Symmetry: D2
Subunit: 308 residues, 4 copies
Amino acid sequence: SMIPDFMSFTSHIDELYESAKKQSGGKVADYIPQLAKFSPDLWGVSVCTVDGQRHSTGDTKVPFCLQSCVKPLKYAIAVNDLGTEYVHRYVGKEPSKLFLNEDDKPHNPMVNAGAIVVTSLIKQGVNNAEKFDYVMQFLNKMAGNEYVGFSNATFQSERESGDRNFAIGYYLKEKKCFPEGTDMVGILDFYFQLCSIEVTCESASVMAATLANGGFCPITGERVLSPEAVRNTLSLMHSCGMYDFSGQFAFHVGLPAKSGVAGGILLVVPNVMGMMCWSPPLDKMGNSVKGIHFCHDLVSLCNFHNYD
Amino acid sequence: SMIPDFMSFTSHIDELYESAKKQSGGKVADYIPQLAKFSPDLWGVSVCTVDGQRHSTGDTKVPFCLQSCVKPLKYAIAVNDLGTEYVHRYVGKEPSKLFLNEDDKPHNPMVNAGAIVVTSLIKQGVNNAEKFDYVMQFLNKMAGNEYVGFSNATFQSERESGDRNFAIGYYLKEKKCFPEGTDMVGILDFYFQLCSIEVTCESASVMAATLANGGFCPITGERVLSPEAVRNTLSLMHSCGMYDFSGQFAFHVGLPAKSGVAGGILLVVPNVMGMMCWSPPLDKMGNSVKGIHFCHDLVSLCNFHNYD
Amino acid sequence: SMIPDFMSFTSHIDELYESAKKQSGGKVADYIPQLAKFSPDLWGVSVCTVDGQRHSTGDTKVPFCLQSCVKPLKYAIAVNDLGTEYVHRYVGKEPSKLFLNEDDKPHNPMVNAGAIVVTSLIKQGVNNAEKFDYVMQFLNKMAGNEYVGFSNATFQSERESGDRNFAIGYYLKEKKCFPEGTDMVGILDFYFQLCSIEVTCESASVMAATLANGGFCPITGERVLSPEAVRNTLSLMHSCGMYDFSGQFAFHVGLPAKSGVAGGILLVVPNVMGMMCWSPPLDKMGNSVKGIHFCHDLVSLCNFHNYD
Amino acid sequence: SMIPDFMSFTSHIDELYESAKKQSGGKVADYIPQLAKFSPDLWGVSVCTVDGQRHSTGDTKVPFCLQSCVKPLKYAIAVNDLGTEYVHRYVGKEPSKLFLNEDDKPHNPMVNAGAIVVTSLIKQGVNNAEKFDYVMQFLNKMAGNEYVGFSNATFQSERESGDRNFAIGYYLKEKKCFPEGTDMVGILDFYFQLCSIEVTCESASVMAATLANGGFCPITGERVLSPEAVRNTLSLMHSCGMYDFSGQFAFHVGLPAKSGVAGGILLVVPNVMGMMCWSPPLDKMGNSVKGIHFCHDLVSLCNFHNYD
Ligand SMILES: O=C(Cc1ccccc1)Nc1nnc([C@H]2CCC[C@H](c3nnc(NC(=O)Cc4ccccc4)s3)C2)s1
Ligand SMILES: O=C(Cc1ccccc1)Nc1nnc([C@H]2CCC[C@H](c3nnc(NC(=O)Cc4ccccc4)s3)C2)s1
């Protein structure tokens, strides 16, 4: 452990939060109205160390949708229940516009085509209502029963306007990427629902902290995810987590992270802490402008980089 | 005109038909059962000169589906009713796996994504029943009322299994390639129906002959297609007509042609004649093995190449 | 023949020349100084029918370099001496940034990598001085001994600055695209020299006219090129001749043409005439802005399109 | 530190070495004779912890060429002398056939085009003899003066046959990727020389160990590389180090590594140890078959993965 005094670390979290606050650039997502509603000035950072110690600053109790931040989490669930070898019969492990790599598999679980296929592996045979409860049970344990809600509003707007996800769905059905007997449209329904699950910075930072803690929820001690599943999820967050910025993020920050279109950035410092940054304004790559800035400052200050 | 005596030309058509007959290679399409039914040994060649003179050899009265051979024809209809400039707001004009070129348009009207968009331009506002009748009225005039039927069997099997066409449909809806207010699924329905229209070599060769005759049906004299529409259709048949073989076909044969998965090859010798070759066995590119062979022999014998 | 009275056709050539003259757009090539010297306002059009009848307007006696306009011509020479089958062991026949197609061959003889390989097939074993004389002997016959000169200035500037052509040369040597025992650097030298041969609109239009005349020089009657070689050259000019505009040129104009960076456009109306348009200002695609305009107007006026 | 007793760790190194030894697959590189000479059965593993403790098994004193294993090392030198910001004006930082990414920069310092450009940044103005001495001085310090030799044989064979590297060189000169005033051919000469530097497993493992030790040579204590330079080098080894296997190596092994065509694998366990595995037989990706196997077994046994 490299935190010595947790109290003066939060003092530095605060100053970093404040530096990020001045970065007004970006553009709140507006392709469904449930994302355009949100205020550019919303900005919250929540820490949960592997100890269970906590600290928030700013808008950490306002709920927003995980969106793509749920991709690592359901990937972790699928590996937990099924193991590396099974899951990656169906999805790549590399960061390579296009839907399918050279082997007719989605490139990785962090791109839509990947997460769609990952969704079709969780808890098969059962209908969508118990599928969603099963994953929800899992998400709660990762957050130690803190806020995990649901936005029916974005679910309907994402289903009704996600023609690209439907194109993905049919293409994957064509090139035979699902387990046989998969209702593809039902799987998309599940996908949209998972994308519409809601968290706060405070509850998400606890989810990231169980990933930071080999699968053990730091505020309940409970074993949630297998060590295998956490190792996999972190590797792919390290390399595929930030859209087309995953490359420069691995180089300059080098921590497992996964951003979403609601402006969350699920950040993991392994064996140290979990975090969730949130500011709805996104840069041209699709990442929280305040989050990106903050993540740079955090590493250039406390030397948290993978190789420091 | 370079046919002198039509009687001894048919004698040479016969010998060519016979040479092609010995080419047993290929593999009948079998992705729906309505195509696997068909007999490898079926082989027919039908000529209809710009005079109206006719000649068939072999299985020229057995009906088969146009499939992709309908792509030039509905493209011709759309240009006829709407002109070059309107149509190619929506679809490319070049032979460039991928659905959309660099300008987010289907590459050309001879690839599925192109023909789907072309379908969405014909006779808009009207419902699908009158759309289909309108195109059917048109197809009859191009064939001088000879056989134009319909295979409800392949329509249902093509709709129920064409997940790639649905993926295309949703992607084009995402990247906004349809005229606004287009029911995309209804357009796919129309697309599948047009692909399921049936002809015989004898009726198709008459369709190709109106294309060979600046839009005038050689056996009714009636003006069917505008000169613009015929010129466009022939250019794109010359360059995009034979799947991934269009390149080598333009080089070595250099005549407007359009093949389909039922093993038809709709061939046009401009200001000379129309033809329809048919043999259900396809080569690795998707073209009638006997048709390809025959088309080579026809040009290397009567010097019909574009530049001879 | 569709020219009736040659005298009133030239009257229409004149009016078209005049319409093109008002199109001041473009940008004279300036990557070597031997091209930046040239005056934007230079504009000449030279016709030579298959009869031998001639007509020029404007700057038709000012010499400029063929540059890429020599690509069809040396391709014609190679097929003449070696036949389709041999030549296309080494170079593609299709219009597919990249140097080599999927079969590790240059896409076609009209892209640099293609023309470089074509150059390595002409008159092998002999040294470069007799190679150049042999091709020069050939170029003279195609022009009926009219102006064929040489710009030593551009040869040296093209050799000294053509690092992309050298990169091409080494890559083709790596992927083994030359006949064995080929001095690759010597072949580039030959390539640069051929690109630096000089013509006038008046002499070039005679070269294009032998291509328009199945290989027979219309003003000497002499057989210059085999019918095979002319047919091949014209097909590839039809489809690969205008850089990234070859597609839209085949659709909208549909005549064999080949442009070069000096602003020439070598145009062929088969069995009718040869032409050479020249205006050093190029559009963003690399084609003579006045030439492109003129070529459109010529077809939309005298209905010379391939399929009209 | 997670090694407790170094003595029983070497006992496990031995058993792993022995397991790898049974893997006879692969194919010794044979594109120059200086690589075909080598014996398939050569197999050595050398460890050098951050303590300075050492252990070898097998052919650890037989010299071989670094080849691409020198790419991280000269990248480290360039960042050391010039800093992140300068170096990556000229070369990418991501793992994206093709020479240049979308910004006309080599994708990363671990692909030839990258390492060539990196070579052109080291110690500019000086001639090649002092350039090579400067890098050699540096390589010695990283190895604590242990074996660093030179194979003039492979230098000449690599220069005389490396047409692909020359094609790279000219293309980079065309797209202006070098600092101005760079003699490109001289830079290739330098590149070939650096690729021909020789090490043994025992001396290389010491080089990897200074990378494992924030830039401090564990057996001389001397500061060799800046912390910046080591952090960068390790990130790019983690993601770009194993040719087209870097992806699956990051997922399944997750340690900075860099392989070469002589069958070396320069392995780094950060803050633990350096290693050099060597077995000339390569798999289809270009990696030491025994090394790949060994690297898997090492992580699945001592839980050395980045995220374990
Ligand atoms: O974006 C553009 C713009 C553009 C134009 C020109 C060049 C590049 C890009 N134009 C596209 N239009 N439609 C596309 C995809 C959409 C998803 C579904 C389809 C596919 N998705 N993935 C695929 N993968 C493979 O086939 C395997 C493979 C491909 C490439 C290299 C190696 C292996 S096909 C087509 S992209
Ligand atoms: O322009 C760019 C920028 C860029 C951005 C985005 C996407 C592509 C490209 N970057 C380049 N980097 N290098 C280039 C030259 C020099 C090295 C060799 C390159 C090639 N020459 N021939 C090739 N063909 C094949 O490998 C086989 C094949 C692959 C895929 C499809 C069909 C055939 S690749 C061309 S351009």
